[PDB]
Design a protein around this nucleic acid. Structure first.
Ligand SMILES: Nc1ncnc2c1ncn2[C@@H]1O[C@H](COP(=O)(O)OP(=O)(O)O)[C@@H](O)[C@H]1O
Ligand SMILES: Nc1ncnc2c1ncn2[C@@H]1O[C@H](COP(=O)(O)OP(=O)(O)O)[C@@H](O)[C@H]1O
Ligand SMILES: [Mg+2]
Ligand SMILES: [Zn+2]
Lengths: 611, 102
DNA sequence: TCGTGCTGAGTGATATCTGCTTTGGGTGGGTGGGTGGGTTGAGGCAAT
DNA sequence: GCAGATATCACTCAGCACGA
């Protein structure tokens, strides 16, 4: 009875397998809570259930071959305390054992439960475990030779990833004489080639050839990770570490993302020259990744639908979008309606119509303009905080360049293009040369940018909302002169903006007193931002308002009345349509009512301000 | 044969000219002169080469000037979406090259 | 009924042999060195 | 002096037919 043992140690593999099988078979999350001194938080439904059994059953129903594992869960159990150390110190063997045990557990679950599930699908499926949360996150500048071939945890920023690389798994050989085909495995990157044909009648030596296109292959990719800027001790070039990901984890992390990766810190020789077995004494270090983490339920939907019933929903959201800003309810309301956006229309026999709202916030300096810009910049999922005189005409739209790795002509995405589907933010609109402003003419009108220069003729979608701010020519705003004089900017440009607000810092004995009491307390409830983001995302994805006849009957009246009192062009009517659609989105309605359009027109007249 | 029959039925109508004028750029509202210009541009003119060898142009160029917020770009988008061969370019983005041989 | 000496056949280890550069390019360097060589031109973009 | 691709020679083994 030979005993299987991991090389260089005294751990019996059968013990590991049985312990892991027992842990998977009988584990309840209550143990995890007990371990962390959270005994009083134990419930009676989720913590009294077989966790990994439900995980495996869900895997089977969804047809997946992955089970994410938590090491702290291993520490929680009784029989797998030593398994945690074994996994930490000998990751490869323990990981393989865990994968095989997971497959065996699935097979046993199917067989014992007497289910009708066919065994073929599970039998031919490769199962892999992806442990994470394996201890403290080591730094990229603290990996020593001592920590070679051990499971570590890293965090960094993705810099560049190579395309998919095919990695051979099983080779295929065919005899040139008898046309006999056999498949041989690959061990440690070496093909166990046969010397002569395996058949008995035919034994011609050296007659076997490799059929390149019939060998099984896997997926390989190489990533470069740069340490977070914070870890840099004294402002030098941040270090980088290479990573390898296979099978599912391929194409899981994009360039320019913050990730936390668990893997084995491996070492490998480098050959001195191509045509010799000679090796350099210095080894290359890299990480073999086994897990990657990029750093709606019915209950939430039932909760969200409860807020919509609230009569004062408009005020609640307007007060929660920017908690700190004081007494700017109309400005907040206008800002909020931009996040929701109008309604999207797909339209053949013409062109697409997009419900995107553009807002201008021009007023006296000390008023909270930039603060609102930053506040909205945080909420939106995509956006670029471009400023005045810090951005260029090309920089906003797109830059033509070349890819050194591929040696091909490529184009980058500018600030406006990078904000596709978000809300762009501009701080100093007046302090911007008119040459660059001409770019925004097409963005706000056609929602697209077309470039034709140096052999590149293509159009990039820029379906983004613009939120810009401007300051008066003088030190303050003078009410006496008209708007077109105080704020600069071409008169026609001001007409493009859907809403153009005017916030001024008047002097009073009570407004100033209340503002001072509000900005000094730093040394009327508001929804948590986490829930608000989900609310706006759900509204933006599911709901799609459709105008009604009552809306049109009075929208014609409103537009004609706006034009009669006299600047007022068709863009104002389209803005009214977009705003009415957006407000209906807030209340989760599929039809735009008279009240919503009334609110839209109310907002428009009271923005420029009702002298 | 069926398409030919439809074509000859089209030609037979004595109100063809205004019918085509109305059909062009249906999304835009009542701009008869501009639609007529776009139609005539699409049809084009006969190009000829004299006994000399010098070539007389046969194509038509049209420039639509208007105040912002008017229906200018709508016509251009319609032409791009209808003409057999055509491209869309912007004044600011375009350069000497790209708009010509590079 | 059977045992053994002679033969052709085929690997194993070992003998000579060629080669020991190689290569255009800056994530191959300049403590590898110029007797191993590298000699644009248009177009785009920031600064102003 | 050193690694790799290549071809050379020598030694030993399983079959065969005959004689015991
Ligand atoms: N209504 C207000 N609510 C909260 N803070 C305010 C208000 N008005 C002024 N402030 C304060 O005054 C400062 C104005 O600066 P800033 O918002 O950068 O002005 P701007 O961006 O228009 O130049 C902010 O730091 C803010 O704390
Ligand atoms: N007659 C019209 N018919 C349909 N839509 C119109 C009409 N006039 C104006 N519009 C709408 O008003 C918007 C503003 O026109 P725009 O394309 O900005 O003109 P410009 O090309 O001068 O910028 C357009 O997107 C268009 O949809
Ligand atoms: Mg500001
Ligand atoms: Zn064979």
């Amino acid at each position: 009875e030979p005993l299987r043992i991991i090389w260089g140690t005294n751990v019996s593999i059968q013990e590991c397998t049985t312990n892991f099988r027992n842990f998977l078979m009988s584990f309840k999350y209550k143990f995890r809570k007990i371990l962390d001194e959270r005994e009083e938080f134990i419930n009676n439904t989720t913590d009294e259930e077989l966790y990994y059994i439900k995980q495996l059953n869900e895997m089977r129903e969804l047809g997946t071959s992955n089970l994410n594992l938590d090491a702290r869960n291993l520490l929680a159990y009784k029989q797998t305390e030593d398994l945690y150390h074994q996994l930490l110190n000998y990751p490869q063997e323990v990981i393989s054992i865990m994968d095989q045990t997971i497959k065996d557990c699935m097979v046993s679950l199917i067989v014992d439960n007497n289910l009708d599930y066919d065994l073929d699908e599970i039998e031919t499926k490769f199962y892999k475990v992806r442990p994470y949360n394996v201890g403290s996150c080591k730094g990229m500048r603290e990996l020593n030779p001592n920590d070679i071939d051990k499971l570590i945890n890293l965090k960094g920023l993705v810099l560049r990833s190579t395309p998919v690389i095919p990695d051979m798994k099983v080779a295929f050989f065919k005899c040139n004489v008898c046309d006999h085909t056999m498949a041989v495995e690959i061990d440690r990157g070496v093909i166990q080639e046969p010397a002569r044909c395996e058949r008995i009648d035919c034994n011609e030596p050296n007659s076997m050839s490799l059929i390149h296109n019939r060998c099984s292959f896997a997926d390989k990719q190489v990533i470069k990770l740069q340490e977070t800027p914070d870890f840099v001790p004294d402002g030098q070039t941040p270090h980088s570490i290479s990573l390898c990901v296979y099978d599912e984890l391929v194409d899981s992390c994009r360039a320019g993302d913050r990730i936390e990766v668990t893997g084995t810190f491996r070492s490998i020789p480098i050959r001195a020259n191509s045509r010799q077995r000679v090796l350099k004494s210095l080894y290359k270090t890299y990480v073999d990744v086994v897990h990657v983490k990029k750093v709606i339920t019915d209950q939430d939907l039932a909760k969200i639908r409860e807020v919509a019933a609230r009569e004062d929903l408009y005020s609640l959201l307007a007060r929660s979008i920017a908690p700190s800003i004081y007494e700017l309810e109309d400005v907040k309301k206008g800002i909020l309606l931009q996040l929701f956006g109008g309604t999207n229309k797909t339209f053949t026999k013409g062109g697409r119509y997009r419900g995107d709202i553009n807002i201008l916030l021009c007023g006296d300096p000390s008023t909270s303009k930039s603060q609102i810009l930053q506040y909205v910049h945080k909420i939106t999922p995509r956006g670029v905080y471009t400023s005045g005189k810090g951005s260029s005409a090309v920089g906003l739209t797109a830059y033509i360049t070349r890819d050194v790795d591929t040696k091909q002509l490529v184009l980058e995405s500018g600030a406006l293009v990078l904000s596709d589907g978000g809300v762009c933010c501009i701080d100093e609109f007046d302090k911007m040369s008119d040459s660059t402003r001409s770019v925004l003419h097409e963005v706000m009108e056609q929602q697209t940018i077309s470039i034709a220069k140096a052999g590149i003729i293509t159009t990039l979608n820029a379906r983004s909302s613009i939120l810009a701010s401007a300051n008066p020519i003088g030190s303050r705003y003078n009410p006496n002169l008209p708007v077109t004089e105080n704020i600069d900017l071409p008169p026609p440009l001001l007409s493009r903006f859907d809403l153009v607000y005017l916030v001024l810092d008047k002097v009073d004995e009570k407004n100033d007193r209340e503002l001072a009491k509000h900005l000094t307390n730093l040394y009327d409830d508001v929804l948590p931002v986490e829930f608000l983001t989900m609310y706006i995302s759900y509204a933006k994805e599911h709901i799609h308002p459709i105008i009604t006849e009552a809306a049109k009957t009075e929208l014609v009246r409103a537009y004609v009345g706006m034009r009669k009192m006299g600047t007022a062009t068709t863009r104002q009517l389209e803005s009214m349509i977009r705003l009415a659609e957006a407000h209906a989105k807030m209340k989760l309605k599929n039809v735009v009512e008279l009240e919503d359009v009334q609110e839209a027109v109310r907002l428009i007249r009271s923005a420029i301000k009702d002298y | 044969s069926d398409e030919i029959n439809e074509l000859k039925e089209m030609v037979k109508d004595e109100h063809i000219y205004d019918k085509l004028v109305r059909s062009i750029a249906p999304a835009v509202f009542g701009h008869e002169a501009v639609k007529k210009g776009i139609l005539l541009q699409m049809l084009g003119g006969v190009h000829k080469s004299t006994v000399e060898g010098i070539k007389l142009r046969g194509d038509i160029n049209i420039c639509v000037v208007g105040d912002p917020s008017t229906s200018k770009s709508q016509f251009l988008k319609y032409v791009v979406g209808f003409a057999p061969r055509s491209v869309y370019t912007s004044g600011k983005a375009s350069s000497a090259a790209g708009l010509t041989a590079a």
